[PDB]
Amino acid sequence: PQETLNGGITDMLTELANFEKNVSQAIHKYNAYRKAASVIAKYPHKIKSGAEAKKLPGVGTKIAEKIDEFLATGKLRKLEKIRQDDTSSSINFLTRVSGIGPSAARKFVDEGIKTLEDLRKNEDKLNHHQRIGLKYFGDFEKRIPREEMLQMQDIVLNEVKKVDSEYIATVCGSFRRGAESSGDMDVLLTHPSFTSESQPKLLHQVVEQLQKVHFITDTLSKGETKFMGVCQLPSKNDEKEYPHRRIDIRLIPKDQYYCGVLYFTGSDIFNKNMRAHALEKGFTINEYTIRPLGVTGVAGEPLPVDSEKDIFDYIQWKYREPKDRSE
DNA sequence: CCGACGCCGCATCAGC
DNA sequence: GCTGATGCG
DNA sequence: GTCGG
């Protein structure tokens, strides 16, 4: 549905969500507001009353009341007030820096650090992640056109194969479902040598190679199974530089790889639906495994999975192309 | 009425 | 120094 | 804040 349909309502609910998460530190209210905003965003009619909205799942009494105030007055008194609150708006804003969460944002504002300029002037109060988040503040908020995701994927797949042609690497996320833009790049990596009952440095060797060709530019976090950092496509000698981008690389044991690919391909709604159906057929699927459930509900041992389609076959579902996993 | 609302790797803190 | 908790994503 | 056991 077009924004003009209920965009005022859904914008209000998203703003309220952000203040619950970042200022009130009420994560379940953040998700409640997000859920309400999403069910309304998909409603194909211009809402006329709170009562009409309350019929949708995730909209309750209090959001219905807020919708009534918004429809009658064009605003919400509580939102107008917190918007102009210097401390609350600064706390909310600072959490847009990757690495600054609600706790750090509150501590910064408490000691008078409220803006990007304030952070800039106080480097020694920032940890490594937060320094990177500040350095790439604008770039990290830009989306990534699919054409650049393809160029990025070209680099990742080539360098991974260069390190060891037995690696398997899959770029997941909405990109794998065919999205025309992405927010970041999520790479799932495995190697036949690595199983859940099992080489050294398997993730390190790939990260190192991507740094050696100057694709990975910074590291936010790095361990034996998960890397989170920053990358940048090369620019033509004369053209403007590409924005720096967020890339994650996860090393997963081969026997759990396709459960991971499935989960991290999504969508979120599709995953929920597939897990729901799985339980109906007596299986429990999580990010790692699919296990049979006995007649008393006791989970059995993980079942062998050698492809995404194996998982579909277990639950008697015909294979769904990533492109068709919107729900 | 009242608990659930995902989970866990990594960086860093709190406490010992 | 180690162990567990917390913040963050 | 909403849902539901």
Author numbering: 7 to 204, 207 to 335
Please give the exact wording used by the authors of the publication that reports this structure:
N6-(2-deoxy-α,β-d-erythro-pentofuranosyl)-2,6-diamino-4-hydroxy-5-formamido-pyrimidine (Fapy•dG) is a DNA lesion derived from a common precursor to 8-OxodGuo. Herein, we examine biochemical and structural aspects of DNA replication involving Fapy•dG and Fapy•dGTP using human DNA polymerase β (Pol β), a model polymerase. The ability of Fapy•dG to adopt multiple stereoisomers (conformational and configurational) increases the possible ways in which a polymerase and other repair proteins can interact with it. Overall, stereochemical dynamics due to configurational and conformational changes contribute significantly to the effects of Fapy•dG on the polymerase activity of Pol β.
The Pol β extension experiments were corroborated by X-ray crystallography studies in which we characterized Fapy•dG at the primer 3′-terminal position opposite dC, dA and T. Initial characterization of a binary Fapy•dG-dC was accomplished via crystallization of Pol β and Fapy•dG-dC containing DNA. The resulting crystal diffracted to 1.69 Å and was solved in space group P21 with Pol β in the open conformation. Fapy•dG forms a Watson–Crick base pair with dC consisting of typical hydrogen bond distances and we only observed the β-Fapy•dG anomer. The pyrimidine ring adopts a conformation such that the formamide group is positioned in the major groove of DNA and is coordinated by a single ordered water molecule. The Fapy•dG-dC base pair is in a stable conformation, as indicated by clear electron density and similar average B-factors of 25.2 Å2 for Fapy•dG and 26.7 Å2 for dC. Overall, the active site is in position to allow binding of the incoming nucleotide.
